[PDB]
Write a protein that binds this ligand. Structure first.
Ligand SMILES: CC(=O)Nc1ccc2cn[nH]c2c1
Length: 185
């Protein structure tokens, strides 16, 4: 692809984080801690899942960023409305304000309702995310496989400002401790 010139510097918003997440000093990395991280609760924090939002809000234009997923077994990535539900159980779908893909149990799927099987020959170590607000597009790219297309959500109805969205996943197996990292431009 040729989206690299729309690169944006994303940082993580600590206030939105699940209380077990550990975000690095530079706000560019996040991982699952083995306990509560000693923060107060608030109405913004994701309660049920190890999720966090980027600080940046997008309401126009074209945006691109990259995320490192090396040696993770489970994660969700994409964008979401600023006003997505934070508390309780919910599914990642456009109806609920999410445009996401994920890895789970050795398969990759797009967060449609119901979910869509992805066809990935080269397991990605870094994912590129492109948003065209005006066109209503969210696209995902396999940076490990020379930028090959993973998935495009088109005819998106964003219906609000967008925020970068992350889920580091649970670590019940002991094999999913590794962080998500925002990759440098
Ligand atoms: C699930 C849920 O609604 N949690 C909640 C709501 C309001 C406040 C204020 N401080 N901590 C809170 C936690």
């Amino acid at each position: 692809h040729h989206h690299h010139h729309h690169m944006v510097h994303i940082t993580l918003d600590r206030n939105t984080a699940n209380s077990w997440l550990i975000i690095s000093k530079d706000r560019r990395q996040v991982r699952m801690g083995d306990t509560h991280q000693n923060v107060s609760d608030n109405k913004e924090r994701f309660s049920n899942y190890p999720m966090v939002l980027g600080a940046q809000r997008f309401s126009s234009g074209k945006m691109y960023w990259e995320v490192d997923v090396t040696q993770k077994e489970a994660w969700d990535l994409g964008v979401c409305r600023d006003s997505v539900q934070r508390k309780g159980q919910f599914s990642l779908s456009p109806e609920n304000g999410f445009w996401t893909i994920w890895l789970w149990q050795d398969s990759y799927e797009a967060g449609t309702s119901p979910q869509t099987t992805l066809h990935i020959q080269v397991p990605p170590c870094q994912i590129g995310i492109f948003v065209d607000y005006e066109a209503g597009v969210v696209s995902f790219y396999n940076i490990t496989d020379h930028g090959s297309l993973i998935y495009t959500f088109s005819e998106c109805v964003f219906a609000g400002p967008l925020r970068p969205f992350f889920n580091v996943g649970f670590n019940y197996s002991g094999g999913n401790a590794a962080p998500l990292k925002l990759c440098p431009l």
